[PDB]
């Protein structure tokens, strides 16, 4: 549309020959002025325009340089056929071309300056066209007039230290020590400083630098590359408007400033060639942006610098895609057990376990990043390193791998993985709880990672039967007396268990899934031991599991194996938390009810008013004995009482003392509003416990939903 109008304007400028119009040419030039600053002079139009400017001489050099400055605003990437039409017009007449009409050297310097300004728009050269361009621009650097502006081109293109061949230095130095250049030392020195950064010390370079010395003034005057900011602003506008998400203003500015910063920083401070066979094989390192990666995709060439592409971003630099390198390598060649990132990651792990590396903390995230998001590799790291062999070597590194790899891993063959992980976790349990090595959260953390893997599995069917079996095989390990205890408990294991007990809670809450309730009821072996434990938040997790599993057992009849033990858990966890009648009932936690009666003999307690009923409630159980006192002393502050309950424990004895020593006020006021009987206090602290701010909300919720006495909340 508009591009057709611009093509017509350029064709009007082209065919404007043999007519010599007085002012029609001026109107065409103004039309070009106003239409090139709007859309952006697509690259074939730029080629036709530079050809018109260099060949024809209808307009003088003043306006030609002016329209090179203010109209050459590309909207795209500068196809490689435009750079040639510029190179083909740079130079001077010679014995061999004495008839060819010369283009004004001022116009040639203007073209080289424009090339410097839009250098971030150069196309990626095909690893041999680059070797030819980096010599064309060096031979064009010998003409003095376009030498101030070809210097940035030789500097920016001189990446890849292979491009620092000494035959270049023989030409750089030869032009610096030359009488009639007047600006060569301050450019040759910049080119040599760039070459120096690229290839290290290189005594030749540093002995050539102090031979053509610039006096620190006409070297700084040459480092400071002054790119026209108005031109670049219009160019950023045109690019962003013409190609969203491809040359946005921020990345274009970051790129221009990166190039200028290279030229500035100059003064402050790669395996082997392999016979590039084809003329069009864009290397991978050279690819700067994503559009260039996609344009040169069928011709891409991934070199064997794996140790470089793996080991250690808005700019459109050559390293802008170093994070995509490993991703666009498994794509080119399909993921083949012989890819470069796979083998690299595996070898780096093998050299991280055997401590043959300096900083594992720097290469381990690089392995987890490439393997956690790739199943074919995440499935071989598990077969190789997830065993006891590599656990005694380094357990601190295997834990990180299991914490990055296992959380996301679905097996390809359901069959042989349950046995594999049972063996793995049993080996970890034996190695972690061995003699002399008490515990350091190796099994509980790895078990935790496995729990996360089991959640991942369970979330998607066809694995929910394998997942829920590994879940119970993990619960049968996280509840062993050596690691899950009542006296020496090491809360690690009681904290990777409440996560397993929540895998189940989330399952039992959701509907529309096929899994027998055999996989949802934990079993009186492990479950009884969770109830008789001592920490409050594990008991809260058990109560949350028990309350969010009834809607899955209503459907089943009463004479069921799993609705009889599930109703047994609640039959006793309710007379162990609220209605303390463990002596009249039978078999509280599988243990007979006269075991407690005999324990309460020789168990010394100073008072004996209400002894057998003193410690079996939510206020007296060693798990929630002090939390209830804290809830009481917090209700006292929330009500601003004036009696301030004078002890910490709540039981039938101390409550009667507190109510007989302050009978006058308790009746009148000064204490918890509704509290008149001990059960009033136990219901008040329960209601305060069921406010969703403390981790023990689920105990109150369970008592409320199952007791049938305080169901009114």
């Amino acid at each position: 549309a508009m591009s057709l109008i611009l093509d017509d304007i350029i064709l009007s400028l082209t065919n404007a020959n043999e007519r010599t119009p007085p002012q029609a040419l001026k109107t065409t030039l103004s039309l070009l002025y106003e239409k090139s600053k709007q859309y952006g002079l697509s690259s074939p139009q730029l080629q036709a325009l530079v050809r018109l400017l260099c060949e024809t001489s209808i307009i003088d050099t003043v306006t030609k340089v002016y329209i090179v400055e203010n109209c050459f605003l590309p909207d795209g990437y500068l196809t490689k056929e435009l750079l040639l039409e510029i190179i083909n017009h740079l130079g001077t007449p010679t014995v061999f071309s004495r008839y060819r009409i010369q283009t004004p050297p001022v116009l040639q310097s203007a073209l080289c300056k424009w090339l410097v300004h839009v250098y971030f728009l150069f196309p990626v050269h095909s690893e041999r066209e680059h070797n030819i361009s980096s010599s064309i621009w060096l031979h064009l650097w010998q003409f003095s007039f376009l030498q101030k502006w070809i210097t940035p081109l030789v500097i920016w293109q001189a990446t890849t230290p292979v491009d620092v061949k000494p035959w270049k230095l023989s030409i750089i130095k030869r032009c610096a020590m030359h009488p009639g250049y007047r600006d060569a030392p301050g450019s040759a020195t910049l080119i040599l400083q760039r070459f120096q950064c690229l290839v290290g010390a290189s005594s030749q370079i540093t002995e050539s630098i102090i031979t053509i010395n610039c006096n620190r003034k006409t070297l700084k005057s040459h480092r400071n590359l002054k790119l026209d900011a108005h031109f670049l602003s219009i160019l950023k506008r045109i690019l962003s408007r013409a190609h969203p998400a491809n040359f946005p203003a921020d990345t274009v500015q970051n790129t221009i400033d990166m190039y200028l910063s290279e030229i500035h920083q100059l003064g402050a401070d790669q395996s082997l060639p392999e016979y590039v066979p084809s003329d069009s094989t864009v290397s991978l390192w050279d690819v700067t942006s994503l559009e260039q990666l996609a344009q040169n995709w069928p011709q891409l060439h991934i070199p064997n610098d794996v140790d470089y592409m793996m080991k250690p971003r808005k700019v459109m630099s050559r390293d802008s895609l170093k994070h995509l390198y490993s991703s666009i390598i498994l794509i080119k060649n399909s993921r083949d057990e012989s890819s470069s990132p796979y083998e690299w990651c595996i070898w780096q792990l093998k050299r991280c376990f055997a401590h043959q590396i300096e900083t594992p903390q720097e290469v381990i995230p690089i392995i987890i990043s490439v393997s956690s998001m790739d199943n074919k590799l995440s499935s071989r790291i598990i077969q190789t390193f997830c065993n006891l062999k590599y656990l005694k070597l380094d357990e601190l590194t295997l834990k990180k791998v299991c914490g990055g790899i296992l959380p996301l891993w679905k097996p390809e063959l359901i069959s042989g993985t349950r046995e594999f992980f049972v063996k793995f976790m049993a080996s970890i349990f034996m190695w972690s709880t061995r003699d002399g090595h008490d515990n350091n959260c190796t099994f509980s953390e790895t078990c935790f990672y496995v729990l996360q893997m089991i959640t991942n599995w369970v979330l998607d069917d066809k694995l929910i039967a394998l997942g829920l079996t590994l879940l119970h095989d993990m619960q049968s390990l996280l509840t062993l007396d050596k690691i899950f205890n009542n006296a020496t408990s090491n809360r690690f294991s009681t904290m990777a268990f409440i996560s397993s007990l929540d895998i189940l809670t989330q399952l039992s809450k959701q509907t529309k899934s096929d899994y027998a309730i055999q996989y949802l009821i934990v079993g009186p072996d492990i479950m009884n031991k969770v109830f008789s434990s001592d920490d409050p938040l594990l008991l809260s997790a058990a109560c949350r599991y028990l309350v969010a599993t009834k809607n899955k057992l209503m459907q089943y009849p009463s004479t069921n194996k799993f609705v009889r033990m599930q109703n047994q858990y609640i039959m006793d966890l309710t007379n162990y938390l609220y209605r303390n009648k463990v002596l009249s009932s039978k078999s509280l936690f599988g243990v007979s009810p006269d075991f407690f009666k005999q324990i309460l003999e020789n168990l010394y307690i100073p008072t004996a008013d209400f002894k057998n009923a003193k410690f079996f409630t939510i206020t007296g159980i060693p798990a929630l004995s002090y939390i209830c006192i804290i809830i009481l002393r917090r209700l006292e502050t929330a009500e601003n009482t004036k009696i301030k309950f004078t002890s910490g424990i709540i039981n039938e004895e101390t409550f009667n003392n507190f109510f007989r020593v302050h009978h006058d006020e308790i009746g009148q006021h000064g204490w918890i509003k509704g509290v008149n009987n001990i059960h009033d206090l136990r219901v008040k602290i329960l209601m305060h416990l069921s406010n969703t701010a403390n981790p023990y909300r689920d105990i109150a919720a369970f008592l409320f939903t199952y007791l049938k006495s305080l169901s009114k909340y």
Partner: protein
């Protein structure tokens, strides 16, 4: 700090005391069976677990008597009471941070699994697209006395640089990148 060495010795002694207590309980409950029977020491897992549950019940009943004979009438002057209140208020302080840390650890997992689902749906499309592209053929990979291969690789490079120079410095508008 005399009292700090005192309390460190107390903690060591209490750990030792608890180890000995649990071991004595287990061995007494084994000796009872060994006396009732003659050699039966292979009680099943569902019974080895009942023994552990009963020991836990006994331990809970043992350390809830302390919260009575020492907390029911708060002395606020004994060296033991002042230790308990400095020990009963420290344990459950992190019970909210810890619970939260599991909700923010199974929330990052929810995002990791969706990021990996996206990766697996992208990489397959990408590999199919890569396969559908026309792969460029490889040259005839011959090996002619690799010394000569090198002596030709550097002989057809001086021709390239000579061509570039003769083209740039003389004339010949049609330079190009294909030398």
């Amino acid at each position: 700090n005399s009292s700090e060495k005192q309390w460190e010795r107390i903690q060591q002694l209490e750990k030792e005391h608890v180890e000995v207590y649990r071991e004595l309980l287990i061995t007494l409950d084994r000796l009872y069976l060994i006396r009732k029977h003659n050699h039966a020491v292979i009680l099943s897992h569902t019974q080895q677990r009942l023994l552990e549950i009963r020991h836990q019940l006994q331990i809970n009943l043992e350390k809830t008597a302390l919260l009575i004979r020492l907390l029911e009438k708060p002395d606020n002057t004994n060296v033991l009471f002042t230790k308990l209140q400095n020990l009963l208020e420290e344990s459950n302080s992190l019970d909210y941070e810890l619970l939260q840390s599991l909700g923010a650890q199974s929330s990052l997992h929810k995002q990791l699994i969706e990021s990996r689902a996206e990766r697996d749906e992208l990489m397959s499309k990408l590999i199919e697209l890569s396969s559908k592209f026309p792969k460029p053929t490889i040259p005839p990979d011959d090996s002619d006395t690799a010394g000569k291969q090198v002596e030709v690789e550097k002989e057809n490079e001086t021709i390239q640089e000579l061509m570039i120079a003769l083209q740039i410095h003389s004339g010949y508008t049609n330079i190009s990148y294909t030398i």
